[PDB]
Amino acid sequence: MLLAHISDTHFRSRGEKLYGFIDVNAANADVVSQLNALRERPDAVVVSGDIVNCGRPEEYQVARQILGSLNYPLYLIPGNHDDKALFLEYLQPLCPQLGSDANNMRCAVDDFATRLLFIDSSRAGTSKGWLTDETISWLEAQLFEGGDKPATIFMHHPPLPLGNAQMDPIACENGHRLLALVERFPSLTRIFCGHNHSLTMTQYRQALISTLPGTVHQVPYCHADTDPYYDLSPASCLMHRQVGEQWVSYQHSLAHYAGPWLYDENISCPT
Amino acid sequence: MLLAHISDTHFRSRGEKLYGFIDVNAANADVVSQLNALRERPDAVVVSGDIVNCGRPEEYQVARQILGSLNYPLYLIPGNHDDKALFLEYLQPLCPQLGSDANNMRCAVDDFATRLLFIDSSRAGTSKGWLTDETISWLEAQLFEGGDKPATIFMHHPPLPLGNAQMDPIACENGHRLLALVERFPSLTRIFCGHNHSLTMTQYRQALISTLPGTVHQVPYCHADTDPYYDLSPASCLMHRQVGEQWVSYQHSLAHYAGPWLYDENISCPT
Amino acid sequence: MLLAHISDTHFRSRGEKLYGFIDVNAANADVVSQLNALRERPDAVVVSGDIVNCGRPEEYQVARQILGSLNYPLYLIPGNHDDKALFLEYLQPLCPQLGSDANNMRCAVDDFATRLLFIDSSRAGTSKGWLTDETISWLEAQLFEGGDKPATIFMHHPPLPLGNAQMDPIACENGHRLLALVERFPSLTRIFCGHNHSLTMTQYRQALISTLPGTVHQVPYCHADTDPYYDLSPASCLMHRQVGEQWVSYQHSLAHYAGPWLYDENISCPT
Amino acid sequence: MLLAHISDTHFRSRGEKLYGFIDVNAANADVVSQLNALRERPDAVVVSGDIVNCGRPEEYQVARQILGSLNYPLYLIPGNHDDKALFLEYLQPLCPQLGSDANNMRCAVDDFATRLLFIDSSRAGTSKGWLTDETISWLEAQLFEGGDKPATIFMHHPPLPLGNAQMDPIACENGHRLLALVERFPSLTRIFCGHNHSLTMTQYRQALISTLPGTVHQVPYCHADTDPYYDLSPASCLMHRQVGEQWVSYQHSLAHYAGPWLYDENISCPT
Amino acid sequence: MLLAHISDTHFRSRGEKLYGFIDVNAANADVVSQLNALRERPDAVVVSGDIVNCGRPEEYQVARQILGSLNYPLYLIPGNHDDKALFLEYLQPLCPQLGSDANNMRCAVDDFATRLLFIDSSRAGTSKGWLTDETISWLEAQLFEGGDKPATIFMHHPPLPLGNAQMDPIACENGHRLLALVERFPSLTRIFCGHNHSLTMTQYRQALISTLPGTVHQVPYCHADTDPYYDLSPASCLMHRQVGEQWVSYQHSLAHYAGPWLYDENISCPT
Amino acid sequence: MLLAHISDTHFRSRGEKLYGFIDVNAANADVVSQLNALRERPDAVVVSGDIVNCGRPEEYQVARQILGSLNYPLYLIPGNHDDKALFLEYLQPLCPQLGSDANNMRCAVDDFATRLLFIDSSRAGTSKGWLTDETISWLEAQLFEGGDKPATIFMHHPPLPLGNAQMDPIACENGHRLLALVERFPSLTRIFCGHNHSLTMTQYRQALISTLPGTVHQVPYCHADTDPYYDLSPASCLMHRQVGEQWVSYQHSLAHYAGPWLYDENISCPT
Ligand SMILES: [Fe+2]
Ligand SMILES: [Fe+2]
Ligand SMILES: [Fe+2]
Ligand SMILES: [Fe+2]
Ligand SMILES: [Fe+2]
Ligand SMILES: [Fe+2]
Ligand SMILES: [Fe+2]
Ligand SMILES: [Fe+2]
Ligand SMILES: [Fe+2]
Ligand SMILES: [Fe+2]
Ligand SMILES: [Fe+2]
Ligand SMILES: [Fe+2]
């Protein structure tokens, strides 16, 4: 298993920029060509929510074209900036197992040594996340029938407060429901999230829980300052690789930088 | 607790650049001024190893001046690029609790809600890591005598293979002995490492185990390619914060990037 | 009083760039978010003319949206690239006291310790400036009733030749009319202008007279070369602050640069 | 008359960078080659002070070599970072009219339509400015014996507070004594200063009074915040030109930027 | 004779980017303003094929506007990405001597000391080039009546394999036909081509044969790797100048870089 | 045969930058690591002259270390910036076939399908080139005794004027003597040169004759302007490859640029 994992693409309509100046459509198209160009090709690409910025039809048309140009199977979940019905209408052909019901979008993937669980934490009419009882019970059934086989969950909102003054009040509001599931099921070992536009990681029992950077703009972590900042600090994604018994996640830079060069011992320490 | 955690500074001697062209001394002096300029000030800075590039006295002179200009308590550990005796001679004044024996540099910090354990995984005459008999024993003594207070270890070499073709053969050779400590001691929940010049994370039992980016040059993760690559992809560090019961780690960019601006709902979705 | 003062925005229609390659709409939207993000928030924003590039309705629609997204009261005046009638139609809702008559756009602001006088130097069918007799007589009435209270004038065209070979032939053609007013009224102490895309300052009696940089492209000052150059040298604006009895103007960079860091005496002069 | 006016070069010793990371010696050598490359050649270059960073002989050796490679007559004055005796020893050969007494470095230039007056506002053992009894007196003698020929003063410290929270407490402490000279002497119409690393301008009676940007690092203007910030925002200098009766100052960018291109009416507004 | 020679502009429709992220329309408009701004003004501009990217009408509308804004006579030829009929419909007014027949576009220019021969190597329904027999016989007539006067050919596809693994299989397929002409006619001394997005030169008898860089994106030369790479390495064009008996070609950078400065012997070798 | 061909490295002494600001030593060390990192490895690297800037021993010490870290056989020749005796003392160990006589440094390489001839066109006490009586004779001996095997010459100075106003007066003064050799010897088909810091090419009989860009700073081509300009436009080198019967030269960028990505037909022309 090799997965490329991006999020918070924030697509705008054709010929619009985010906030009028951040060319998200071009930046994401660059990211898509970067992923198509990888030497070690992933089995699939995950996009963990906030696919579009305003939940508008014309933004989904752009998303559908640019994400549709990935030469990979996709697993897509919504974020709070998404519109559940339009998300399903435009993006379900790219990710068929989302289903038919915009209020119950989720699926399990059983192709790999670790099972993948994709869920919808977005709630209409708010930025905060919410796990519906049907999501929690579907998750219980998945984890129970899964038995010993390890599981990872992908969702948009982090299920616990991470100390980020801007992002915490809009985390998953009833994230305790997922925490309770990691306590029940030792099989559940990874939860990956978007929303925060930041690589921030923590551990609850046997679960590693991490948020991801955005593909374009980032949000700095502040503990005591509430100003809604964003910046254009370097974009990245997470590659997830099954390495024997270990699920390993590594950061893959989406920036354009100098290098690589080859290490040479004589050049390292001249005599 | 707030810790700034940097790694793999690779200082060179006063007039010199790494490989002749990468100005590590200037890049690290910038990092140091960035850390002194933070609005949310850390309690301490951790430098997890490969402090100098060649193990030479003149590189340690530069490291002592530049790391000495941090306005923070420091916790310093060696990497394989370091020389134990010189590391002690030059850097112990910046981290007195290392001790007096260059063969047994270790310390436990008990000031915070989580116990911090700093060890030397470097071995003279090789790039691979090794945990001495004394280290393994001292580590076990800290955990055994430490009750239910959680512990995090800082060491230079990853204690397990991560699938990185360049970096795996030179991980901690008897790292499985530390993995046996995570199995027996549920209070051991974090292991942070340098060596890899890459953010790569995994979970083993309750332990989250992560390598860090370097402050200057990075090494990309390849699964099959053993070509010794490095590049100048964006540098960053890890901030570690205690957030109630949670140890949270977030990536702090050390690059210079546009921003920040403030989010405005009307600019986000114009009508 | 704190004023942020920008000019020569040169807005184009949606999806056009200036000259086909300078993204003025994105650059100005960046500037607008920068101004919204200021820690020391101005009382108002002044835009001293050449709001649009071609005087076209679709350019005013873009200007109205982007300038309308400033979280500040605005004072707007036209430049030669503007169309007086369309300027009034689209931008008067953003600056109500311009009035109702496109040929007599001007206003006085009496909110601060120094009174602010906004005038229209643009003339239909030419690049040169012109002060109509109704503007001059309105100015005489304003300065006479103002008495001892200091006054600053904002206009698009500089009222005297500044030695700039490109810009001088298209300065205010009858600028002597304003010069004559500074001679009559010792109360008149600042005249700020756009047009030149350059920070160029001079003094006539008690008046400081300055042109401003553009928000996007600049024009270099040449004394003896007549080629109509423009470049993308660094953009800035002027902040105007009342400091006791002093009106002070300082340059605020609109570029994205490294820093800030904090000054430290030990780092400044190592021993 | 054409003068290029730079300020606050802050040279370091031969192998050294400012704060360990800002290459002032290289940045200043670039500035020097830019000045030698101008098509419109100045009659003289003014360096208004803080020539070196630490007042050390080896910094003056670098300053003498780099400033000595200007193909222009120089007018040099000290700042608080300078050492008077060493400034005289090393730099008087580049500006012979400074004199022979390191405690009374002053000169009047009478070659142009405006008299130029160069003074030392620096005081040993402090960052604030001070006008010695002898300086104030000599300044008054120049103005009193100078009739109706206009005068401009170059000095390092601003003679009045500008509202800059970082820089105001370290302005010229008895600067009001120079303000008394502008009140009594209408021929005194320009005062130009370093110290602030910022273009900030004000008018007092007939005098335009301005601080300059540095050639390398800048200090932002804050009204309330006293945190000692500096940044690497775009560097520039001031060109001073005599244009008939007008002394005109314009900002000349020292950055490397795209351009110039030529304005074309058809490219500006396509049909 | 001075010719500016660009190629492979790859224009897209209004508001589209190449591959969704490379702003070719803006980049080419920059190039056009750079060419308009040249101090040594060319007699004509040559564009050697792949004017548009997809052969679509809306792309030709953009090409026609941007190339139409060059203040020079143009010589335009098609490449494989072009559509012969639409090329003629939109671009023939910019280059009248292309003619009236989209299948037989070619012309001779006899204005200079060397005659210029523009031909169409593009073939409908393929990327490979093809020289029709009517092109070869027209060329024979041109070279025969030309006699002793030297000749240069401009065509899109290189007439021989250059060892480029990506580009060779799509060179001119029957390029031997042109090679046979250089063997017959010692008068034929230059053949310039687009297609390769790379400055690559060779010699066959008395003919210098060269491909050109693109105005925007480039393609790296690989000998043994077949992956269809492109990059944004620096763009340039070729200036062709008649220097007495010599046709000389020099590379003119279209990038924005630091400089120029003037060489000074004292600054070069300090003493 | 694959040759990497660089030129005009202009090394400075250990702590020094070219003109005080261009870090040639670092830029060349980067070039060297780029060359060692190529996937398609050259058989040899050619350095066509102006190896050091000032002809000083300490510059040769740097050149020997940096050029000595190339993992390739080297062919080195002098330029006018070089000192013959010191060039031999320091660099002959890197290119033993230069010989033992600093006045007659020449060698023929016969390893490949094309004979390579390396000569010294530099003359002590001038910037112009000169072919010694012995060189011309030895060159003729190589060609006369060499039969129908093709030959390429590497020399520092162009053997003919190229129309470059700065560089033409300092070309090879008796270069016409080498032109006489191309006339008599059809096997002589390539002459490659440094000196110009510009890719400029021409053909004389069967010989393709080209100058190279420098590895660091470039000199623009001007026809009328003699002002001694240099700039930091993109650096590159020439790769020379034997492709069957064809000697092919391609430009290899030494800049750091975005890319590469992979061409995709669907991303190229979306529907
Ligand atoms: Fe988001
Ligand atoms: Fe979100
Ligand atoms: Fe390391
Ligand atoms: Fe290491
Ligand atoms: Fe304007
Ligand atoms: Fe204007
Ligand atoms: Fe200063
Ligand atoms: Fe100062
Ligand atoms: Fe092409
Ligand atoms: Fe092509
Ligand atoms: Fe050279
Ligand atoms: Fe040379």
Regarding quaternary structure, how should these chains be classified?
A: homohexamer
- The largest sheet of chain A has its strands arranged as 4-5-6-7-9-8
Order of helices and strands of chain A: EHEHEHEEHEHEEEEEEEH
**What is the strand tally of chain A?**
13
Measure the end-to-end span of chain A: 45 Å
**Percent helix of chain A:** 10-25%
Identify the CATH architecture of the largest domain in chain A: 4-Layer Sandwich
- Total number of helical segments of chain A? 6
Q: Quick one: CATH class of the largest domain in chain A? A: Alpha Beta
- Overall geometric form of chain A: globular
Biggest interface found = A-B, 70 and 71 residues
Q: What is the CATH topology assignment of the largest domain in chain A?
A: Purple Acid Phosphatase, chain A, domain 2
Radius of gyration of chain A, CA atoms, in whole angstroms: 19 Å
The biggest beta sheet of chain A reads:
6 strands, mixed
Structural class designation of chain A = alpha/beta
Strand content of chain A: 15-25%
CATH superfamily of the largest domain in chain A: GpdQ, catalytic alpha/beta sandwich domain
Protein name (chains A, B, C, D, E, F): Glycerophosphodiester phosphodiesterase GpdQ
GO molecular function (chains A, B, C, D, E, F): 3',5'-cyclic-AMP phosphodiesterase activity; glycerophosphodiester phosphodiesterase activity; metal ion binding
Binding site for Fe cation 1 (chains A, B, C, D, E, F): 8, 10, 50, 197
InterPro entries (chains A, B, C, D, E, F): Calcineurin-like_PHP_ApaH, CNP_phosphodiesterase-III, GpdQ/CpdA-like, GpdQ_beta-strand, GpdQ_catalytic, Metallo-depent_PP-like
